[PDB]
Amino acid sequence: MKQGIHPDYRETTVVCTCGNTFTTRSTSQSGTLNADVCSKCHPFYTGKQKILDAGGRVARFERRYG
Amino acid sequence: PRSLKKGPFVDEHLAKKVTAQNEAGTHNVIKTWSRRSMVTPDMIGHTIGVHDGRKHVPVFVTESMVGHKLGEFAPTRTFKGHVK
Amino acid sequence: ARLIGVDLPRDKRLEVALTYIYGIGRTRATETLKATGISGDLRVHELTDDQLVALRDHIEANYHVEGDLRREVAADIRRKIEIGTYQGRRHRSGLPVRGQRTRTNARTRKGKRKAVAKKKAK
Amino acid sequence: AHEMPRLKKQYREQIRAAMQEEFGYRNPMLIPGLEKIVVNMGVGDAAHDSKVMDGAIRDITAITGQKPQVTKARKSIAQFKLREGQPIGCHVTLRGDRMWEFADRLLTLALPRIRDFRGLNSNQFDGKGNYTFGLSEQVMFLEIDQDKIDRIRGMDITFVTTAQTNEEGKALLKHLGFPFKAKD
RNA sequence: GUCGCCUCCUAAAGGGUAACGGAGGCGCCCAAAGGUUCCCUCAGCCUGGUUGGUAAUCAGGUGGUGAGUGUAAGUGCACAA
RNA sequence: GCAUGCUACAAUGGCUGGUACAGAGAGUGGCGAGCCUGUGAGGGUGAGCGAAUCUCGGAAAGCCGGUCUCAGUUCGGAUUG
Ligand SMILES: [Mg+2]
Ligand SMILES: [Mg+2]
Ligand SMILES: [Mg+2]
Ligand SMILES: [Mg+2]
Ligand SMILES: [Zn+2]
Questions:
Q1: Domain of D167, in residue numbers
Q2: Which of A39, B54, D80, D132 could be joined to D158 by an S-S link, Cβ 3.0–4.6 Å?
Q3: Residue D1 within any structural domain of the chain
Q4: Where in the sequence is the signal peptide annotated (chain D) (predicted)?
Q5: What are phi and psi of A64, to 5 degrees?
Q6: Nearest-Cα residue of chain C relative to residue B81
Q7: Is A38 known as a binding-site position?
Q8: Does C5 touch chain D (CB under 8 A)?
Q9: What span, in angstroms and rounded, lies between the C-alpha atoms of D138 and D108?
Q10: Residue A44 among known ligand-binding residues
Q11: D137 closest-nt by C1' vs CA
Q12: Where are the domains of chain A?
């Protein structure tokens, strides 16, 4: 590393507002990181959406007629 | 659209023809002028010649047709564009 | 990135900042506020993260919003196209689908008037 | 400060053991590992002004943590409207601790908050165990500010690993943890 | 139309060699495009990648000269000139 | 393409709660109150009235309180699911 050309880069706590706190390092100037969602918190792979689709075209028919 | 408590409207001769086709083999084209009728699962996999005003255009009814009228698949006007 | 995929605009009341979300309208936002028990007359910049995430959870649980609803709508239109209904044919033609007249204006679907030369009188 | 990163520790213990057991390398220094991370951004709409390059430098500096290398145009092109020697892109090479902690930060924080995030394709490997992908938008890196960015920009992220083959590269990056769908 | 200078061919493996023979250039440019020292290897092709396309920037693989050389051409130059 | 209109482009306004003041007309396969049900269109029951009697019925603008604060908007309401 060359002195005086790189940004401030020091110890950095992150809190994910989902029970997760970690001790990474980043350039977050005079401060830390207050995330909105974590990896182990995001509904993507923790598996909390399961949208797939709604392909029951006939199922709609017997839903409103059967 | 039609009221739910009145049920779907199938023109009561298309129904009997498709039921006869089901009983005796789902292989024939059913010629009808009933653009008025509602596609139903009981006719799925059939081919129906829907009148469009001058000709009975055939439609092969698939799974997704069910929530539609027979006449939706037999366009009545031809445009092709202005000029050429 | 305040809510699901949209940033609520600051200095605007919550009851309409919610409607700023795709898939949320006036009555949908009003319900959301009554369910979450959050006032609707306070500006968004005074919003604690706990109530913000409670509102987010309610919206995500009850409502199709943003990318999900946009993809669902696009899928519905594409299904009409691929099934070939009259509405699907009108969609492919880029022409009104709900039985609107097309002789005179139909302008919001036909775009701007691309006037064409016609026959000339004597 | 002196502390060997969480992601590096996880890699060493768990991933080296897992690769040694489920690829059966006959030599201990054959287990693949991350060699470097390259963060590129081509900002080609810099042939008409310099402020865009300044914003890109600020953004990439904040995201990575070191000054970027600014590449000048190798050849001029009229239809792209760039002259010779104009700065049209900037990139950063991360190795060692900076590599490990930037990867940890990225995976744990940033791409989780992609709009309608659906994961990353598993078929974006170069064919030699290295995986490169692209982010269409930048402020999603919450290590930067929000209400002062000049304009939205994107970037390319490349993980170069000492993996001989694509399948073992995919295994390594899966064990490190990426959102990997089952789609093309 | 041409007249001085430069490069190639004619020119018959030293040099030289004519025609209103065949091809082109020059009347500059550069305070670095000079001196020195250290470092580097290209073009093309293949694969992957936000904007981005054949081709901008990035990664890996390949690739010895086919790139490059301020300016014509030849002789050179990758040991790099 | 033309023509006649409607709704607009907002603050003399939008939204919301409360609260005043009409006329002229229509009605038995009709006008339907009241009650119950539904977010609502409506549905179920269903009196009354061939009607200066009963029903359509609520008049709206306005006034009053709250709110929005000049934003392509809490304007506009086209289009589309
Ligand atoms: Mg000679
Ligand atoms: Mg000789
Ligand atoms: Mg002589
Ligand atoms: Mg009468
Ligand atoms: Zn989280």
A1: 6-184
A2: D132
A3: no
A4: none
A5: -95, -5
A6: C93
A7: yes
A8: yes
A9: 16
A10: no
A11: E50
A12: 1-66
